[PDB]
RNA sequence: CACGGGAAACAGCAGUGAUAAAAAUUAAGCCAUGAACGAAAGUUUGACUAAGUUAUAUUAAUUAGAGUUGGUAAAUCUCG
RNA sequence: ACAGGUUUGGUCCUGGCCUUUCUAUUAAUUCUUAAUAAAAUUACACAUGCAAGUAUCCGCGCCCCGGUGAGAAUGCCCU
């Protein structure tokens, strides 16, 4: 699923 | 209302007057009593052996009211309600 | 009332039939209420007590007619002659106590044929009437059960060798129980 | 419906009544039609009355109409596998289109039929549940249970309240 | 080479001998009536209409099986005496699938005592019902098939719906079903109310009730005062084929009559009151031939 | 339920388990029923697991796909 | 619902009133709710006797060794409820329970005759 | 979002302050079922089971008050 | 909707508002008992007790159950 107004989420990979 | 009522009902066309002026046997398929072919009026005199043109598709005028609720789209709070005796 | 020997009676006499006449019983019966559109629900009971409650309904005005399964003159006044089924509350105007009363004693007379209701041609219900299949029939007795010998083996109880007794008292030691020996085969009644 | 030439093709029963299924491995239909011309009597016709019926029973099935392109009325089928399927109909009238397109590409009466009897047994009737999914809600609703004890109470030799006065006496 | 109910001769001969009335077999049902559609037909179409309600009466003519009674189910799959008064109620398991025929599945109860056995008839059917619900079939035996009530019925002529009633509620092999059937056929002989079921599906098993239990004389006196004589030779006809070895049927074939005579050999043979039937035939005889 | 991240209680903090006692005799014989029951339980779901293969290859390729498959190909052409 | 792990289990799902219980035998994944979702529902078991005597129980014997085929697992109450049809070995427990009953009904025996003597 | 920062967490059960027209017990048990762990007897579990409280709904009975009475819309007189 | 009240000295037509039906919350007045279902102001701040342990050490499990509707036109169906 996916939609028009996806944000590229950062910190999320950061803290991984 | 009144007057419109008894016009409407005056100009009521009877089967015995439907099959004189076709001259066709009218053949009433009761619902509750199978496919049994109940006959209701004769048409006195000459008899056409001519079948009715079998359409395709009927053009006949539907009223939007009558094909809503048959299709089961009216859905108000008083249609169903129960009401006393007449 | 000297009625509950028979209460067809009272539909036999001479009171009814000058009284109500050949129309039912809830024909001259109209029930007020706070416009157009009746609620939907009557009331619930009209003879709270020993006091009636206002302009009674057409079961609770009379106390000779009882509700029962016995008279089906009564009953079919409540039961539509053509579509075969029963008038709601709305319809005639009694109370829901009343109203209760009636679909319980109409449905205990349909249940013993005292009235007519339609009933509809039923098919069999298997395509295939054979009782060939072990299903049904009896099936050859198993070798461990012509014998007496339960199923498994370990279903029975068997003493455990005393070394291996041992070697579980040397392991749970110190938080050992007091072992049991072989039950009862049969246990008897208090 | 008071709008339109013929207001009986716009409702449920018309677009369920028509009888034609096609097979899994057909994807697109095109249909090429004149305006004029008697010969494209049958062509217009059948855009006119069956299309709508084909479409209700085949909702995955894309349909094109292309007017006044060749001067032969046809219809081209596309299937899975690359195959075209060429239908020509310069005389045959509305009823022979929809035989013909039935025997082709539609499925036969005995799949559907054995296609809707595979279907029934989803919804087996010896399931509990919802009632928009099993017939019955609980196990009180089978005569010679227990019954609910909302409708008719239970005896108080039953009642976990009883129970736990005796045990706690 | 026995005789049996599901044979084209006699299916054939009873076929034209319950007859074929389309007024009675299409009979309006006390259920949500409907407004009636008309249509417009020649008389070429109405001969169309009416053969085609024939055949649909012949379909809803279909006569319900008759078989003899079920033997008992006594088999026990395994006996565990461990489980002796771990339980004190039984333990009832049915196989529930959609693709295996009922006559198929496993009931298997556990009885208190710990024996594996097999369901009996009487709980076999119940537990079907509970988990394969189907209309017309009550859980627990109605109390409408109790001998008072159906006196009731029979004193209101409900002949036609007790049959109906039994073959949709109990199993036509079982036990309950031979016995109610039997107790109607027997009232209906009684009170000579054979008129009831001309057209019902249910004609031919009482008649096939009657050639087994050689009791005609009351049905063919109902038949000649009907006037119904090209079927009465047949039920006559069956007679013979039921029971060959007997002398009735060795007149048959010592005087080789036809017609009415074959009712005058059973008359006079094995008919055990064959006083009315030969004044009956009589009585026919000369009101015929002043009619024609 | 607790989660992962919150801290336990106190009063519960100090005891760890409390194993019951072990009758000798009855505790044997049910390691002896139980190495039995798990061994014939063991059999049947593997005779069941057996089981579902063959259903699935039957009808992947089955005789009767093939018939089916072959069918309607040649009713195609 | 996305889990992170969890086994494919036949479990029973509690049902009905208050003082009325009902159990349906379900097969969901272990991680779901007690009356969550689920992938097929297998049969019945009334709890409570009824005017017959009986404590009725539905199963689907074609459907439940598919799943057991695939790798399902059991709870303690489906294998007890399994044994009692014969479809399984009795359970062990189920037999120790059933000598335990015996020993204190023994026990219950010569106490009480002895408190008599 | 959460490396970090503000900052020091009941949107788990029960309960409290503030706030709102909105008012359940700071209770019992793992006997059943479900989940975790153990080969196993088994242990934990405010999920749940059985209870406490409230006309919020439905039923039965042991229970009698409220509203309305110009018209739509069932129903009144005498005084102020 | 089976419709009803209301424009005007008055009739017809067009056109609003409202009545009559059912469900929930709060409040007023009133209240005897039993059973079942449900329990709902607030993503505001929280005292105290409890909600994840099991197990011959390793390991496995630890918003999984449960809670809430803040956020996002989010989504539903489907590959
Ligand atoms: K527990
Ligand atoms: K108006
Ligand atoms: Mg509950
Ligand atoms: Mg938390
Ligand atoms: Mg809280
Ligand atoms: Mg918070
Ligand atoms: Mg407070
Ligand atoms: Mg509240
Ligand atoms: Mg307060
Ligand atoms: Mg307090
Ligand atoms: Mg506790
Ligand atoms: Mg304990
Ligand atoms: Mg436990
Ligand atoms: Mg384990
Ligand atoms: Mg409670
Ligand atoms: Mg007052
Ligand atoms: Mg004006
Ligand atoms: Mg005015
Ligand atoms: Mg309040
Ligand atoms: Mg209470
Ligand atoms: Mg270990
Ligand atoms: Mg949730
Ligand atoms: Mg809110
Ligand atoms: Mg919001
Ligand atoms: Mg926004
Ligand atoms: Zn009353």
Redesign the pocket.
């Known amino acids: 699923?996916a939609?028009?107004?996806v944000r590229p989420?950062?910190?999320?990979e950061?803290?991984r | 209302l009144t007057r419109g009522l008894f016009l409407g009902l005056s100009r009521q066309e009877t089967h015995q007057q439907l099959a004189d002026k076709k001259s066709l046997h009218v053949v009433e398929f009761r619902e509750e009593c199978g496919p049994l072919p109940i006959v209701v009026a004769s048409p006195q005199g000459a008899l056409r052996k001519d079948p009715e043109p079998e359409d395709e598709v009927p053009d006949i005028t539907l009223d939007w009211?009558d094909v809503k609720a048959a299709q089961g789209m009216?859905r108000?709070?008083?249609?169903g309600?129960k009401?006393?005796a007449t | 009332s000297p009625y509950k020997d028979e209460p067809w009676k009272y539909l036999d006499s001479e009171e009814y039939q000058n009284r109500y006449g050949s129309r039912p019983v809830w024909a001259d019966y109209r029930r007020?209420?706070?416009?157009?559109?009746?609620?939907?629900?009557t009331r619930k009971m009209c003879i709270?007590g020993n006091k009636v409650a206002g302009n009674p309904c057409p079961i609770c005005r009379d106390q000779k007619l009882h509700v029962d399964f016995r008279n089906v003159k009564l009953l079919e006044q409540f039961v539509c002659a053509h579509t075969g089924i029963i008038f709601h509350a709305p319809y005639t105007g009694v109370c829901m106590?009343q109203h209760?009363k009636l679909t319980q004693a109409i449905q205990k007379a349909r249940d013993h044929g005292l009235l007519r209701y339609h009933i509809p041609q039923v098919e069999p219900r298997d395509l295939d009437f054979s009782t060939t299949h072990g299903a049904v029939s009896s099936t050859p007795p198993a070798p461990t059960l012509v014998s007496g010998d339960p199923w498994y083996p370990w279903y029975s109880w068997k003493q455990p060798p005393e070394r291996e007794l041992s070697r579980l008292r040397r392991?749970y030691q110190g938080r050992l129980r007091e072992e049991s020996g072989p039950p009862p085969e049969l246990m008897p009644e208090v | 419906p008071m709008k339109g030439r013929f207001p009986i093709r716009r409702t449920l029963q018309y677009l369920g009544q028509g009888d034609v299924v096609f097979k899994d491995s057909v994807k697109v239909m095109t249909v090429n039609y004149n305006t004029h011309g008697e010969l494209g009597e049958g062509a217009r016709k059948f855009v006119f009355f069956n299309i709508p019926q084909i479409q209700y029973k085949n909702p995955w099935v894309q349909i094109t109409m292309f007017k006044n392109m060749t001067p032969s009325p046809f219809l081209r089928f596309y299937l899975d596998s690359g195959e075209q399927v060429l239908v020509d109909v310069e005389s045959k009238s509305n009823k022979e289109i929809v035989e013909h397109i039935r025997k082709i590409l539609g499925k036969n009466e005995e799949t559907l039929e054995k296609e809707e009897q595979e279907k029934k047994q989803l919804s087996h009737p010896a399931h509990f549940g919802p009632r928009k999914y099993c017939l019955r809600e609980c196990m009180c609703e089978v005569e010679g249970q227990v019954p609910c004890?909302?409708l008719v109470?239970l005896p108080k030799e039953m009642?976990?309240?009883y129970?736990?006065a005796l045990k706690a006496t | 080479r026995k005789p049996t109910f599901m044979d084209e001769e006699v299916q054939n001969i009873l076929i034209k001998m319950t007859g074929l009335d389309l007024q009675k077999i299409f009979k309006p049902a006390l259920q949500e009536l409907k407004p009636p559609t008309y249509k417009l037909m020649t008389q070429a179409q109405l001969e169309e209409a009416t053969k085609q309600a024939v055949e649909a009466a012949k379909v809803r003519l279909k006569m319900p099986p008759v078989l003899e009674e079920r033997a008992p189910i006594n088999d026990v799959l395994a006996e565990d005496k461990i489980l002796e008064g771990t339980e004190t109620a039984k333990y009832v398991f049915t196989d529930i699938s959609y693709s295996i025929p009922h006559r198929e599945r496993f009931i298997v109860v556990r009885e208190p005592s710990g024996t594996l056995r097999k369901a009996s008839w009487e709980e076999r059917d119940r537990m079907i019902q509970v988990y394969f619900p189907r209309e017309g079939r009550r859980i627990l035996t109605p109390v409408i098939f109790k001998e008072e009530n159906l006196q009731t019925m029979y004193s209101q002529d409900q002949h036609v719906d007790v049959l109906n009633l039994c073959v949709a509620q109990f199993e036509p092999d079982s036990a309950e079903y031979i016995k109610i059937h039997h107790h109607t056929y027997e009232d209906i002989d009684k009170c000579g109310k054979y008129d009831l079921l001309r057209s019902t599906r249910h004609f031919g098993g009482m008649a096939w009730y009657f050639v087994n239990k050689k009791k005609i004389d009351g049905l063919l006196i109902d038949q000649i005062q009907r006037d119904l004589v090209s079927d009465a030779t047949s039920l006559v006809h069956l007679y013979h084929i039921l029971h060959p070895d007997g002398q009735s049927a060795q007149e048959a074939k010592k005087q080789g009559a036809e017609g009415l005579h074959l009712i005058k050999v059973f008359a006079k043979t094995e008919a055990q009151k064959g006083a009315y039937i030969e004044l009956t035939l009589q009585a026919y005889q000369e009101a015929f031939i002043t009619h024609s | 339920?607790?989660?992962?991240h919150?801290p336990?209680?106190?009063?519960?903090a100090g005891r760890?388990?409390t194993?019951?006692?072990?009758?000798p005799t009855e505790?044997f014989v049910?390691?002896e029923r139980?190495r039995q029951y798990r061994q014939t339980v063991r059999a049947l779901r593997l005779e069941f697991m057996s089981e579902v293969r063959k259903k699935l290859h039957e009808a992947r390729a089955g005789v009767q796909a093939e018939r089916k498959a072959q069918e309607d190909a040649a009713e195609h052409r | 619902?996305a889990?992170?792990?969890?086994?494919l289990?036949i479990?029973?799902?509690?049902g009905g009133?208050?003082?009325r219980?009902f159990?349906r035998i379900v097969a969901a994944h272990?991680?779901?709710?007690?009356?969550?979702r689920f992938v097929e529902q297998l049969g019945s078991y009334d709890?409570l006797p009824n005017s017959h005597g009986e404590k009725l129980v539905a199963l689907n014997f074609d459907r439940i060794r598919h799943w057991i085929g695939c790798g399902a697992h059991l709870?303690?109450?489906?294998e007890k409820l399994l044994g009692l049809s014969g479809f399984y070995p009795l359970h062990p427990?189920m037999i120790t329970n059933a000598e335990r009953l015996r020993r204190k009904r023994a026990r219950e025996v010569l106490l009480a005759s002895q408190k008599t003597d």
Not at chain 1, 9 to 12: F, N, S
Not at chain 3, 32 to 41: D, L, S, V
Request: with cysteine; net charge positive; aromatic share 6%.
């Open positions: 699923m939609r028009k107004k989420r950062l910190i999320a950061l803290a | 009211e009216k108000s709070v008083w249609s309600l009401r006393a | 007020n209420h706070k416009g157009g559109i009746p609620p939907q629900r709270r106590k209760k392991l | 004890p909302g109470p009642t976990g309240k129970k736990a | 339920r607790k989660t992962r919150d336990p209680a106190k009063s519960k760890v388990a194993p019951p006692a072990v009758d505790f049910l390691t139980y | 619902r889990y992170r792990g969890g086994h289990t479990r029973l799902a509690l009133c208050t003082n219980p159990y272990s991680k779901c709710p007690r009356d969550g709890p709870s303690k109450p489906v427990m």
